mmCIF file of C-alpha atoms and ligand atoms in Angstrom:
data_model
loop_
_atom_site.group_PDB
_atom_site.id
_atom_site.type_symbol
_atom_site.label_atom_id
_atom_site.label_comp_id
_atom_site.label_asym_id
_atom_site.label_seq_id
_atom_site.Cartn_x
_atom_site.Cartn_y
_atom_site.Cartn_z
ATOM 1 C CA UNK A 1 -20.482 0.391 -21.047
ATOM 2 C CA UNK A 2 -19.535 -2.870 -22.272
ATOM 3 C CA UNK A 3 -20.491 -2.152 -25.824
ATOM 4 C CA UNK A 4 -17.806 -0.688 -28.145
ATOM 5 C CA UNK A 5 -18.099 1.696 -30.928
ATOM 6 C CA UNK A 6 -16.890 3.517 -32.768
ATOM 7 C CA UNK A 7 -19.417 6.389 -33.446
ATOM 8 C CA UNK B 1 -13.308 -3.170 -41.718
ATOM 9 C CA UNK B 2 -12.348 -0.045 -39.949
ATOM 10 C CA UNK B 3 -15.385 0.248 -37.684
ATOM 11 C CA UNK B 4 -15.154 -1.851 -34.267
ATOM 12 C CA UNK B 5 -17.631 -3.800 -32.616
ATOM 13 C CA UNK B 6 -18.164 -5.959 -30.517
ATOM 14 C CA UNK B 7 -21.365 -7.641 -31.474
HETATM 15 C C1 LIG C 1 -11.339 -1.523 -27.469
HETATM 16 O O1 LIG C 1 -11.617 -3.171 -27.241
HETATM 17 C C2 LIG C 1 -10.793 -3.917 -28.033
HETATM 18 C C3 LIG C 1 -11.208 -5.019 -27.616
HETATM 19 O O2 LIG C 1 -10.874 -5.726 -26.469
HETATM 20 C C4 LIG C 1 -9.102 -3.454 -27.471
HETATM 21 O O3 LIG C 1 -8.333 -4.359 -28.748
HETATM 22 C C5 LIG C 1 -8.976 -1.793 -27.920
HETATM 23 O O4 LIG C 1 -7.644 -1.607 -27.477
HETATM 24 C C6 LIG C 1 -9.901 -1.094 -27.150
HETATM 25 O O5 LIG C 1 -9.680 0.137 -27.366
HETATM 26 C C7 LIG C 1 -9.289 1.089 -26.412
HETATM 27 C C8 LIG C 1 -8.552 2.222 -27.177
HETATM 28 C C9 LIG C 1 -9.754 3.388 -27.377
HETATM 29 C C10 LIG C 1 -10.561 3.034 -28.516
HETATM 30 N N1 LIG C 1 -9.221 4.737 -27.411
HETATM 31 C C11 LIG C 1 -10.551 3.329 -26.166
HETATM 32 O O6 LIG C 1 -9.665 3.690 -25.049
HETATM 33 C C12 LIG C 1 -11.149 2.031 -25.790
HETATM 34 C C13 LIG C 1 -12.135 1.900 -24.543
HETATM 35 O O7 LIG C 1 -10.100 1.149 -25.275
HETATM 36 C C1 LIG C 2 -9.320 -3.626 -32.268
HETATM 37 O O1 LIG C 2 -9.825 -4.856 -31.862
HETATM 38 C C2 LIG C 2 -9.163 -5.899 -31.962
HETATM 39 C C3 LIG C 2 -10.021 -7.398 -31.889
HETATM 40 O O2 LIG C 2 -10.124 -7.277 -30.244
HETATM 41 C C4 LIG C 2 -7.570 -6.080 -31.630
HETATM 42 O O3 LIG C 2 -6.941 -7.172 -31.828
HETATM 43 C C5 LIG C 2 -6.929 -4.897 -32.134
HETATM 44 O O4 LIG C 2 -5.747 -4.612 -31.497
HETATM 45 C C6 LIG C 2 -7.839 -3.547 -31.986
HETATM 46 O O5 LIG C 2 -7.365 -2.558 -32.704
HETATM 47 C C7 LIG C 2 -6.522 -1.601 -31.738
HETATM 48 C C8 LIG C 2 -5.615 -0.783 -32.468
HETATM 49 C C9 LIG C 2 -6.401 0.380 -33.566
HETATM 50 C C10 LIG C 2 -6.888 -0.310 -34.417
HETATM 51 N N1 LIG C 2 -5.275 1.180 -33.963
HETATM 52 C C11 LIG C 2 -7.549 0.846 -32.601
HETATM 53 O O6 LIG C 2 -6.752 1.571 -31.483
HETATM 54 C C12 LIG C 2 -8.295 -0.152 -31.884
HETATM 55 C C13 LIG C 2 -9.452 0.516 -31.004
HETATM 56 O O7 LIG C 2 -7.538 -0.884 -30.998
HETATM 57 CL CL1 LIG C 3 -17.252 5.972 -29.954
HETATM 58 CL CL1 LIG C 4 -8.268 4.331 -30.913
HETATM 59 CL CL1 LIG C 5 -17.542 -8.205 -33.144
#
């Protein structure tokens, strides 16, 4: 993970 | 805004 979003 | 991140 480590990313974010939101999709 | 309204979206997220983190870039
Ligand atoms: C997403 O990350 C930001 C930056 O640290 C935090 O401020 C935020 O609380 C965090 O969002 C939580 C709530 C969410 C979106 N329902 C998910 O549970 C994420 C993984 O964590
Ligand atoms: C979104 O990220 C910023 C920067 O890290 C935080 O300061 C903010 O608290 C976080 O927003 C919260 C609250 C919100 C907008 N209702 C959402 O749950 C997000 C994911 O987390
Ligand atoms: Cl998402
Ligand atoms: Cl949320
Ligand atoms: Cl960002």
